Amino acid sequence: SYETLKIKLALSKYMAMLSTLEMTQPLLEIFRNKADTRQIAAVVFSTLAFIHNRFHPLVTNFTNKMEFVVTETNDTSIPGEPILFTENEGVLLCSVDRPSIVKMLSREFDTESDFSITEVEATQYLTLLLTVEHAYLHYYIFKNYGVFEYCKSLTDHSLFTNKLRSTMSTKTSNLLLSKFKFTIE
Amino acid sequence: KVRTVTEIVNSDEKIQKTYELAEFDLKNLSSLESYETLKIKLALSKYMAMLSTLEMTQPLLEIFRNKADTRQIAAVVFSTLAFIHNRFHPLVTNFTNKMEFVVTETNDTSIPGEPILFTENEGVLLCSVDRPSIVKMLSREFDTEALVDFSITEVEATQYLTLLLTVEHAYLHYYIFKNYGVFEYCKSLTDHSLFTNKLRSTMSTKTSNLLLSKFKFTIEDFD
Amino acid sequence: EELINMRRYRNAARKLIHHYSLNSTSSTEYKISDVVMTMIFLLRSEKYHSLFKLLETTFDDYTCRPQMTQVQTDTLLDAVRSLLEMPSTTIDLTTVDIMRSSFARCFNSPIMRYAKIVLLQNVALQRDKRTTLEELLIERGEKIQMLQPQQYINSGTEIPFCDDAEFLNRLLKHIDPYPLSRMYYNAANTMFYTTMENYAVSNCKFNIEDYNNIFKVMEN
Amino acid sequence: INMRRYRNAARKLIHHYSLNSTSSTEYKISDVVMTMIFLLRSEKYHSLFKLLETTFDDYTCRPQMTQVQTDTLLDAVRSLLEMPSTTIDLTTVDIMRSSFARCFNSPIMRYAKIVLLQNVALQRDKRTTLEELLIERGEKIQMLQPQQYINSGTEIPFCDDAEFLNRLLKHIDPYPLSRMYYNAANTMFYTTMENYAVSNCKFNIEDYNNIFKVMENIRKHS
């Protein structure tokens, strides 16, 4: 449909973040590495910025400030969102489970001049952006609502999706997340 | 047993898939310590069980310290070897007719290193052990525990355990030799490094016993 | 002691003792036997045996030390001067307390300890099968402060609205018509299985229904 | 003067040095001093005290003593240790004496410079390694027949009642078994290798470490 056309077009324009400028791409899965955090931090940060300036039309002058850490081990495990974010007195802080990202990309996929393309690539990019959305939601809620209720939403992400949606589906519309539905039984 | 369905707003078309609990409870069981403790506890229990048929001669250290007889020493050794072998594989045995064996009496007769030594010629498999060194090894403990109806003593259970690791270490070399002859065996026991670097073929449903995964030291002097 | 040739040994003893005044140091070098020899010298003579028997407190803090007569005290400084050469400088309990602090700067238990093994506990989780992350947050979050943060790539303020349609064109002419559905299916599968495996590790249990509501998006 | 307490402390030092106690944090200088004081005030032990005094390289002159004297001294030693249950080579004690000479000559400061070295003391050795060792071994081994063997119902003894075993299980249940490995086994093994110092085989941790890379493989194969 024209809707599917628009969706694929959106993904395509995100493929500008794909093969983004200056970004060395030894892999699309460089989490395989451990030596250099910089590249993983960069991709995360750039994805955040892209999403933010999608969701709002005007603040191109995005903040240049952050600190990050790489979670690696069970005693540092954070079940639920694999990636975590806060602002701390004007200090953006974030944390990443490289092992979980690795295993997610690792899991095998079902199926039913020159150039080429492969569906698995889009699969990876989709999964990335999808997982990022959840963190962006918790970021957004915290960004104005206090720590108290923010952590409440962390204990139960359902709440905010149930209640404070006053930015109605009109505002939600660019969040292609809503296109997908699922049930577990 | 859990069914799931996934859908896209634009269409009723839906994908259906099911997943099974069992592996998950398996995984958590394997991640739970007490479950893991069962393994080593069972190991020690079964070993003592086999010994229960033995003319056990409980004061193990002093029995080994007797010197007045070697029959019991040899039988203990052999039985331990069999124990390890049947551990590693469920269905194994060794030819039982006779393996006349040796007692090692002094450092001049003893290897500094693996106290249990193996040699063969003309089909005469043979092994040797330094009772002096083994006794000295057993003689010393000082467990203060300041760290972070059979009357089986907790302390002596320590010695009851300790030998097994050495014996297993020997078993490794025995296996390597038995599979690859004299030259590879001696070359490997020049430097234990090579062991796993070769024998990935060890892969099996049951593991070695050294699960507390560090045995390390200050890295100074690592010149 | 016949073996101990006390004259030289006392001489060395004093050569140290002076350093318990910062006026002196043992040529930046010292041997345990030097200290031992000093203590021996103290224990060879009653005038110095008194001081020696005082000094045990200097590591056994809680040891009793009573008051003394004015003369009984000055006796000790007399013995100190008799040991010392050119004692015409200041001799006082100030110097005595400087000596006590100098013992507390000499005995700092510089370890010997020979050598020992080191063991590790690789993993651990508790038996309460439906423990919850919530309390686990209490431990986890401490790592924010325990662990070093890592500096952002200070590229400068920007957002990549810099993606004009040249590569885009042939990308959107590849634009392969893959069955987007099943890719979404795989994505959701892996995403849920993530958390399922996380819980199956952590030995925790969670509301499937609440996870559903957490997921749910579409309304109106 | 609490001679009693002094001894009670002192003991542990020699106890460790002689034989590798699985206790730890033995070190302090005050303990050493009290040890020396006790030895000084123990006439019967003055021989030992004056021997242990000898701690200087250019003058290394441990006197000749008649076997009689040496035996009496070892008796004294064992008694005071309350461990006649075994006797150790005087050579070990003299090696520890040389170790103490190291300590003495080392002005080790606030920094916990643990020596960590295995004892190097020994006399008139030749440098040796696995080469020399192997070359030596063959004749010394082959010169002797093995003693004996006889069968005793040898073939494959097997397990018994699980509940019978659970008795012993419950007996065993509480103990710090997870630590027991360090609490004796590993320490004793690693310390055993003073045999290398015997006849000056240059022991190298550089393969003893092999255990470490070895142990990964179970986790590799899950």
This entry's atomic model was obtained through cryo-EM
Name the token pair of B85. Answer: 């072998």
Interface test mutation site (partner C, options D34, D49, D61, D106, max chain C beta carbons within 10 A): D106
Contact C168, A16 (CB under 8 A): yes
B12 touches chain C (CB under 8 A): no
DSSP per-residue string spanning B45-64? HHHHHHHHHS---S-HHHHH
Interface test mutation site (partner B, options C111, C119, C186, C208, max chain B beta carbons within 10 A): C119
Residue showing tokens 């953006």: A92
Question: Looking at this protein, which amino acid is placed at residue D3?
Answer: M
Task: Provide the 3-class DSSP secondary structure of residue C111.
Answer: coil
A70-73: long-range contacts (C-beta < 8 A, 24 or more apart)? A70/A37, A70/A40, A70/A95, A70/A96, A70/A98, A70/C150, A71/A95, A71/A96, A71/A97, A71/A98, A72/A97, A72/A98, A72/A99, A73/A99
Neighbours of chain C (3+ CB pairs under 8 A): A, B, D
Half-sphere exposure of B203 (CA within 13 A, CB side): 8
Give dist(CA C88, CA C75) in Å, integer: 16
A49: left (phi over 0), alpha (psi -120 to 50) or beta: alpha
Q: Are strands A180-184 and B2-8 parallel, antiparallel or unpaired?
A: antiparallel
- Please, which residues bridge with residue B119 across strands? B126
Residue showing tokens 């002419």: C173
C189 touches chain B (CB under 8 A): yes
Return the ∠ at Cα C42 (arms to C41 and C45), rounded to 5°: 90
Among A181, A183, A184, whose Cβ lies nearest the Cβ of B9? A181
Indicate yes or no: CB of C33 within 8 angstroms of CB of D55.
yes
Cβ within 8 Å of residue A173, ≥6 positions away = none
User: Which helix (H) or strand (E) is C194 found in, with range?
Assistant: helix C180-202
Give the chain A residue nearest B8 (alpha carbons): A180
Name the residue among D14, D33, D41 with its Cα closest to residue C59.
Answer: D33
Give dist(CA D169, CA D166) in Å, integer: 5
CA D130 vs CA A93, B38, B177, D202: distances in Å:
57, 41, 19, 9
Return the ∠ at Cα B125 (arms to B122 and B131), rounded to 5°: 140
A15-23: long-range contacts (C-beta < 8 A, 24 or more apart)? A15/A125, A15/C168, A15/C171, A16/C160, A16/C162, A16/C163, A16/C168, A17/A46, A17/A47, A17/A50, A17/C160, A18/A125, A19/C167, A20/A46, A20/C160, A21/C160, A21/C162
φ, ψ of residue D151 to 5 degrees: the values are -75, 150
Return the ∠ at Cα A31 (arms to A26 and A37), rounded to 5°: 90
Give dist(CA C43, CA D69) in Å, integer: 28
Residue showing tokens 């992350």: C133
D29-40 and D3-18 are packed helices; what angle lies between their axes, rounded to 10 degrees?
110
Indicate yes or no: CB of C218 within 8 angstroms of CB of B9.
yes
Contact C20, C103 (CB under 8 A): yes
Name the token pair of B11. Answer: 């269409």
Return the ∠ at Cα C154 (arms to C150 and C157), rounded to 5°: 135
Cβ within 8 Å of residue A106, ≥6 positions away = none
Q: How long a stretch of residues is chain B?
A: 223
Indicate yes or no: CB of D24 within 8 angstroms of CB of C112.
no
Give dist(CA C165, CA A8) in Å, integer: 15
Contact B129, B77 (CB under 8 A): yes
A50 touches chain C (CB under 8 A): yes
Question: Looking at this protein, which amino acid is placed at residue A148?
Answer: F
Give dist(CA B63, CA B53) in Å, integer: 17
Q: How is residue D117 annotated by DSSP?
A: P
Do B and D make contact, counting contact as 3+ CB pairs within 8 angstroms? yes
Give dist(CA D129, CA D196) in Å, integer: 9
Start-to-end C-alpha separation, chain C: 102
Burial (CB count <10 Å: 0-12, 13-18, 19+), residue A49? buried
User: Which helix (H) or strand (E) is A182 found in, with range?
Assistant: strand A180-184
Question: Looking at this protein, which amino acid is placed at residue B161?
Answer: L
Name the residue among A7, C43, A118, B71 with its Cα closest to residue D36.
Answer: C43
CA D192 vs CA B133, C119, D186, D195: distances in Å:
8, 19, 10, 7
Name the token pair of A111. Answer: 């199926």
C176: which chain A residues are within 8 Å (Cβ-Cβ)? 117, 119
- Please, which residues bridge with residue B19 across strands? B2
B217 touches chain D (CB under 8 A): yes
Which stretches within chain A are classed as H helix?
Answer: 2-14, 38-55, 98-106, 119-144, 147-155, 158-162, 169-172
Indicate yes or no: CB of B217 within 8 angstroms of CB of C115.
yes
- Please, which residues bridge with residue C134 across strands? none
Q: What does this entry list as its resolution, in Å?
A: 4.7
Q: Are strands C150-151 and A67-71 parallel, antiparallel or unpaired?
A: antiparallel
Q: How long a stretch of residues is chain C?
A: 220
CA C89 vs CA A146, C23, C84: distances in Å:
70, 12, 10
Indicate yes or no: CB of B6 within 8 angstroms of CB of C185.
yes
Name the token pair of C204. Answer: 């925790």
Indicate yes or no: CB of B214 within 8 angstroms of CB of C118.
yes
DSSP per-residue string spanning D174-191? TS-HHHHIIIIIHHHHHH
B33 touches chain C (CB under 8 A): yes
Name the token pair of A177. Answer: 């997340």
Name the token pair of A64. Answer: 């240049």
Give the chain B residue nearest C193 (alpha carbons): B19
B4: which chain A residues are within 8 Å (Cβ-Cβ)? 182-185
Contact C42, C74 (CB under 8 A): no
Task: Provide the 3-class DSSP secondary structure of residue A97.
Answer: strand
CA distance D103 to chain B (A): 18
Buried residues in A168-182 as b, exposed as e (16+ CB within 10 A): eeeebeebbbebbbb
Contact B2, A185 (CB under 8 A): yes
Give dist(CA D123, CA A13) in Å, integer: 80
Alpha carbon of residue D9 to chain centroid: 20
CA C61 vs CA A95, B47, C73, D198: distances in Å:
48, 52, 20, 44
Name the residue among B152, B159, B167 with its Cα closest to residue B65.
Answer: B159
Cβ within 8 Å of residue B193, ≥6 positions away = D207, D210, D213
Task: Provide the 3-class DSSP secondary structure of residue C219.
Answer: coil
Q: How long a stretch of residues is chain A?
A: 185
C197: which chain A residues are within 8 Å (Cβ-Cβ)? 103
Name the residue among C197, C182, C184, C193 with its Cα closest to residue A184.
Answer: C193
* CA-based max dimension of chain D: 68
Among A117, A158, A182, whose Cβ lies nearest the Cβ of C176? A117
Name the residue among B99, B97, B63 with its Cα closest to residue D146.
Answer: B99
Buried residues in D179-207 as b, exposed as e (16+ CB within 10 A): bbbbbbbbbbbbbbbbbbbbbbbebeeee
A181: which chain B residues are within 8 Å (Cβ-Cβ)? 6-9
Q: How is residue C187 annotated by DSSP?
A: H
User: Which helix (H) or strand (E) is C55 found in, with range?
Assistant: helix C46-55
B6: which chain C residues are within 8 Å (Cβ-Cβ)? 184-185, 188
Neighbours of A90 (CB within 10 A): 7
- Please, which residues bridge with residue A183 across strands? B5
Burial (CB count <10 Å: 0-12, 13-18, 19+), residue D119? middle
Name the token pair of B28. Answer: 């958590």
Indicate yes or no: CB of B9 within 8 angstroms of CB of A184.
no
Give dist(CA A20, CA B10) in Å, integer: 31
CA distance D94 to chain B (A): 19
Give dist(CA D16, CA B140) in Å, integer: 10
A169 touches chain C (CB under 8 A): yes
CA distance D128 to chain C (A): 24
C122: which chain B residues are within 8 Å (Cβ-Cβ)? 211-214
Cβ within 8 Å of residue C50, ≥6 positions away = C75, C76, C79
Give the chain C residue nearest B23 (alpha carbons): C200
B154-190 and B71-88 are packed helices; what angle lies between their axes, rounded to 10 degrees?
70
- Please, which residues bridge with residue A84 across strands? A95
Name the residue among A105, A90, A44 with its Cα closest to residue A69.
Answer: A44
B146 touches chain C (CB under 8 A): no
C182 touches chain B (CB under 8 A): yes
Name the residue among C175, C189, C210, B10 with its Cα closest to residue A180.
Answer: B10
Give dist(CA C143, CA A133) in Å, integer: 25
C200 touches chain B (CB under 8 A): yes
Q: What is the dihedral of CA D16, D18, D20, D21, to 10 degrees?
A: -40
C184: which chain B residues are within 8 Å (Cβ-Cβ)? 6, 8
D46-53 and D29-40 are packed helices; what angle lies between their axes, rounded to 10 degrees?
130
DSSP per-residue string spanning chain B? -EEEEEEETTEEEEEEEEE-SHHHHHHHHHH-HHHHHHHHHHHHHHHHHHHHHS---S-HHHHHT--S--HHHHHHHHHHHHHHHHHHSSS-----S---B--B-SGGGS-SS-SSEEEEETTEEEEE-BHHHHHHHHH--------------HHHHHHHHHHHHHHHHHHHHHHHHHHHHHHHHHHHHH-TTHHHHH-GGG--SS--S--S---B---TT--
Name the residue among B28, C202, C135 with its Cα closest to residue A74.
Answer: C202
Name the residue among B79, B72, B73 with its Cα closest to residue B55.
Answer: B72
Contact B51, B80 (CB under 8 A): no
Give dist(CA B222, CA B218) in Å, integer: 9
DSSP per-residue string spanning C19-50? GGSTT--STT---HHHHHHHHHHHHH-HHHHH
Neighbours of D99 (CB within 10 A): 18
Contact A30, A24 (CB under 8 A): no
Give the chain C residue nearest D56 (alpha carbons): C33
Strand order in the sheet with B2-8: A180-184, B2-8, B11-19
Q: Are strands A67-71 and B11-19 parallel, antiparallel or unpaired?
A: unpaired
Name the token pair of D2. Answer: 């609490």
Indicate yes or no: CB of A67 within 8 angstroms of CB of C152.
yes
Indicate yes or no: CB of B4 within 8 angstroms of CB of A184.
yes
B2 touches chain A (CB under 8 A): yes
Name the token pair of B68. Answer: 């007045």
- Catalogue the E-assigned strands of C63-144: none
B149-158: long-range contacts (C-beta < 8 A, 24 or more apart)? B149/D167, B150/D167, B150/D168, B150/D171, B152/D168, B152/D171, B152/D172, B154/D175, B156/B60, B156/B61, B157/B44, B157/D172, B157/D175, B158/D180, B158/D183, B158/D184, B158/D185
D66: left (phi over 0), alpha (psi -120 to 50) or beta: beta
Cβ within 8 Å of residue C119, ≥6 positions away = B212, B214, B215, D179, D181, D182, D186
Interface test mutation site (partner C, options D2, D14, D33, max chain C beta carbons within 10 A): D33
Half-sphere exposure of D139 (CA within 13 A, CB side): 3
Q: What is the dihedral of CA A85, A88, A93, A94, to 10 degrees?
A: -20
Start-to-end C-alpha separation, chain A: 30
Give dist(CA D20, CA D193) in Å, integer: 12
Interface of D with B in 52-81 (CB under 8 A): none
Name the token pair of A107. Answer: 């899991």
Q: What is the dihedral of CA D156, D161, D162, D166, to 10 degrees?
A: -110
- Please, which residues bridge with residue B125 across strands? B120
Name the token pair of B33. Answer: 């310590």
Contact A20, A46 (CB under 8 A): yes
Question: Looking at this protein, which amino acid is placed at residue D167?
Answer: R
Q: How is residue C18 annotated by DSSP?
A: G
Which stretches within chain D are classed as H helix?
Answer: 3-18, 29-40, 46-53, 67-81, 90-105, 130-142, 162-172, 177-180, 186-192, 194-197, 205-208, 210-220
Residue showing tokens 């259970």: B157
